[PDB]
C-alpha cells in the first residue's frame, strides 16, 4: 500500500559537491519515472533569456548575417529569469516588446588599420579585429535603470568569439533578448548537461582473495576495490566512482565470480549550468514546474 | 552520409530529451539503424566509430590508411585498448538510458564518433499541389510545370492499374 | 569558419576556448590531450569540437574587397 | 604517435600564406598531366 508518508520516511538527498556552475547530488528511493521528469524539465521546460530577434544595420564582415544572428542567439546571457515576463505571440510588433519583456543589446564594431612594427599577429596589427561576446553593450530601455542597476546584463562567458574583422569592415546590430523555454529552441536551455546515472552495484560472489584480488583492483577505477589480505579480501569501497566499463566480464578468472547490476532507485544527478542560474536553483525550478504542471491540471474543468 | 557509402535521408529531427542519454551524459547527434549494416557489410564504419572515440578522448589522431593493420593486429584490439586505457568499454559500447521511460536500456549501446557528410541534392524542389490551375489551349487539360504548379500525370500505366482494380469511376 | 559557440551534442559553451587552446599548444608546448583537460573539456562530445576545428575564417579574411591590395 | 592533425601548422599557414613555394606539392602533381600538356605547345625543343 503506497503512501506519500511512506515516501517521505525513505527519501534521502546526499549532495556530493556544489560548485557555482555544476552541482552533483544523489536522490535515493524515488522512481525512475519521477527522476526522469526532473532531468526532462531542466533541459526543456525551465526558462531562460536568449537573444531572439536580431536587427542588423550594417554587417560588412565575412560571416553571413543569418549566421552571425545565430551565433548571438547561442550566447548565454547572465540575466536572472523571474525579472522578465513572457512576451505575447498574438499581439503585433509595435506592442510586443516592452520594457518588461525584452532586453536590448547592441554591437558597433569597426576595424581599422593600426601602424605597428612587423607574419604579424592581428591583435597587434588591426584595431578591433576580434569581436568578443562582452562587446554586446546592454542598453537599459524604459524603466530598466532602477531595476537592472545592481545586475547589468553581461554574457555569462564574456570571451565567446563572435566574429572577426579586417579594416573597412564593420558590424552594427541591435538584438532583442526575450525569455523562452529550451524545448522550443536549444538556446534557451538553462543547463549544459543535466543528466543522471544509476548507482552501479558490484556483487562479488566467491571470495576472490590473493593475487587474483590485485587483478580485480585493475578491472575498476582505483577508488572502487580495496584489498587488505586474504582476510578483508576484496570489498567495494565506493561504487559511485565506477563507470560501467565491464572490463571484469572479459576475464576468465572472474566471469563467474561477480555480477554487475545497478541500484535501481539510487540516482546520481549531474547538473551543469549555462551561467545564468546556479545549478542547485535550476533544480528547485524543475521540481516546482512539475508541481505547477500538476496543479494546473488538477484545478481545471472537463467539458464534454 | 558517412565515408563508407551509408547514406540515408533524415527521417525526423527528433527532440532532445526523449533521445537516449549516456552514463557520461552525452546524447548522440545521429542515430543510425543497426539493420543497415548486415546487408551492406560496411565494417569500416564499425572500426571508425571506436577509432574516433579513442581519438577524441586521448587527444590524438589515428591513421586509417588501408592495410596498416593485419590479421594478427586487428584494429578492434588496437583501438579497443585505447578505450580501455581511458576507462571506457573495450568494445565501444556505452551504457545508455531511455529518454522516454528513464529506465536503463537492455544492452550497452554502440556509440562513437563518425565523420559525417551532407549531400548537395536536397528535397526542397520536389513537391507540388494542384487544384484548378492553368489549362492548355488546344486540349483544355491541366498544364505541365512545377512553376505553374499543376499537372500530375495519370499516364499509360496508371490507367491500366485503374482498369485492373475494376473501379470504373476512379478511371472516369 | 569561426569556432562554434556551443557544443553540438551536450551544449557546453565552447567558443571561448579557441584562443586559449592555441596558447596552450604554442606557449606551454602541451599536447592536445592536456590542453583540452586544462580548459575543462572532459566529455568527448565537447573535446572533439575544439580538437577538430579548422578555423577557416583566417583564410576567408585575406580577401578584403574594402581595402587596397 | 600514429597520425597528427597539424593544428598549429594549419593555423600559421592560414594567416601566413607561403611566400616562397607552395605547400602540398602532391596537389600540383595531380594536374601536371594537364598543364604540362598545354606547356608543350609553346615550350620544349623546336619551340
Amino acid at each position: 500500500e503506497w503512501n506519500v508518508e511512506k515516501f517521505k520516511k525513505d527519501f534521502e538527498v546526499n549532495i556530493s559537491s556544489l560548485d557555482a556552475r555544476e552541482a552533483n547530488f544523489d536522490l535515493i528511493n524515488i522512481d525512475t519515472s519521477i527522476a526522469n521528469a526532473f532531468r526532462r524539465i531542466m533541459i526543456s521546460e525551465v526558462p531562460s533569456v536568449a537573444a531572439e530577434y536580431v536587427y542588423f544595420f550594417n554587417n560588412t564582415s565575412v560571416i553571413q548575417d543569418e549566421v552571425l544572428a545565430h551565433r548571438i542567439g547561442l550566447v548565454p546571457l547572465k540575466v536572472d529569469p523571474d525579472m522578465l515576463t513572457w512576451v505575447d505571440s498574438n499581439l503585433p510588433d509595435d506592442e510586443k516588446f516592452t520594457d518588461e519583456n525584452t532586453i536590448v543589446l547592441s554591437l558597433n564594431v569597426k576595424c581599422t588599420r593600426n601602424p605597428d612594427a612587423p607574419s604579424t599577429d592581428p591583435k597587434e596589427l588591426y584595431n578591433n579585429a576580434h569581436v568578443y561576446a562582452r562587446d554586446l553593450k546592454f542598453e537599459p530601455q524604459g524603466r530598466q535603470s532602477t531595476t537592472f542597476a545592481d545586475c547589468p546584463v553581461v554574457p555569462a562567458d564574456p570571451d565567446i568569439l563572435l566574429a572577426k574583422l579586417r579594416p573597412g569592415q564593420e558590424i552594427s546590430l541591435k538584438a532583442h533578448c526575450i525569455l523562452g523555454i529550451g524545448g522550443d529552441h536549444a538556446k534557451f536551455s538553462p543547463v549544459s548537461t543535466a543528466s543522471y546515472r544509476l548507482l552501479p552495484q558490484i556483487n562479488i560472489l566467491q571470495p576472490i582473495k590473493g593475487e587474483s584480488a590485485r587483478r580485480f583492483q585493475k578491472c575498476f577505477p582505483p577508488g572502487v576495490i580495496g584489498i587488505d589480505e586474504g582476510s578483508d579480501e576484496a570489498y567495494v569501497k565506493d561504487a559511485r566512482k565506477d563507470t560501467v566499463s565491464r572490463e571484469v566480464l572479459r576475464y576468465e578468472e572472474f566471469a563467474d565470480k561477480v555480477k554487475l547490476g545497478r541500484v535501481r532507485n539510487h540516482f546520481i544527478f549531474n547538473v551543469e549550468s549555462a551561467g545564468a542560474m546556479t545549478p542547485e536553483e535550476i533544480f528547485f525550478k524543475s521540481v516546482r514546474i512539475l508541481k505547477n504542471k500538476a496543479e494546473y491540471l488538477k484545478n481545471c474543468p472537463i467539458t464534454q | 552520409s558517412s565515408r563508407h557509402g551509408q547514406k540515408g535521408v533524415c527521417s525526423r529531427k527528433w527532440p532532445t530529451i526523449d533521445m537516449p542519454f549516456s552514463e557520461t551524459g552525452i546524447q548522440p547527434d545521429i542515430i543510425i539503424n543497426p539493420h543497415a549494416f548486415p546487408s551492406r557489410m560496411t565494417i569500416g564504419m564499425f572500426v571508425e566509430s571506436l577509432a574516433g572515440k579513442a581519438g577524441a578522448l586521448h587527444g590524438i589522431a589515428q591513421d586509417s590508411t588501408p592495410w596498416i593493420f593485419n590479421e594478427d593486429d586487428t584494429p578492434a584490439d588496437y583501438f579497443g585498448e585505447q578505450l580501455a586505457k581511458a576507462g571506457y568499454n573495450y568494445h565501444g559500447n556505452e551504457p545508455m538510458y531511455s529518454g522516454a521511460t528513464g529506465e536503463e536500456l537492455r544492452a550497452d549501446i554502440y556509440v562513437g564518433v563518425v565523420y559525417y557528410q551532407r549531400l548537395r541534392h536536397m528535397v526542397n524542389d520536389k513537391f507540388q499541389v494542384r487544384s484548378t490551375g492553368p489549362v492548355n489551349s488546344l486540349t483544355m487539360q491541366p498544364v505541365k510545370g512545377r512553376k505553374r504548379h499543376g499537372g500530375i500525370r495519370v499516364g499509360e500505366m496508371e490507367r491500366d492499374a485503374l482498369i485492373g482494380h475494376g473501379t470504373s469511376f476512379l478511371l472516369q | 569558419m569561426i569556432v562554434p559557440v556551443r557544443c553540438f551534442s551536450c551544449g557546453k559553451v565552447v567558443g571561448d576556448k579557441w584562443e586559449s587552446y592555441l596558447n596552450l599548444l604554442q606557449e606551454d608546448e602541451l599536447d592536445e590531450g592536456t590542453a583540452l583537460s586544462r580548459l575543462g573539456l572532459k566529455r568527448y562530445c565537447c573535446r572533439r569540437m575544439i580538437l577538430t576545428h579548422v578555423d577557416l575564417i583566417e583564410k576567408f579574411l585575406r580577401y578584403n574587397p574594402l581595402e587596397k591590395r | 604517435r600514429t597520425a597528427d592533425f597539424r593544428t598549429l601548422e594549419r593555423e600559421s599557414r592560414f594567416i601566413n600564406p607561403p611566400k616562397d613555394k607552395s605547400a602540398f606539392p602532391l596537389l600540383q602533381e595531380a594536374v601536371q598531366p594537364h598543364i604540362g600538356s598545354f606547356n608543350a605547345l609553346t615550350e620544349g625543343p623546336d619551340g
Binding site: 552533483n24 577505477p221 566512482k241 | 557520461t24 578522448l57 584494429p75 581511458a86 | 572532459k42 | -
Partner: peptide, 24 residues
C-alpha cells in the same frame, strides 16, 4: 612487418560524475 605502434603515455580520462582527478 612491424605491428602498428602503440602510443605510450595513455591514461584514464573518463571518471564518473563528481570525480575529476582523485586517483593516485
Amino acid at each position: 612487418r612491424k605491428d602498428v605502434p602503440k602510443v605510450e603515455g595513455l591514461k584514464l580520462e573518463h571518471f564518473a560524475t563528481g570525480y575529476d582527478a582523485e586517483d593516485f
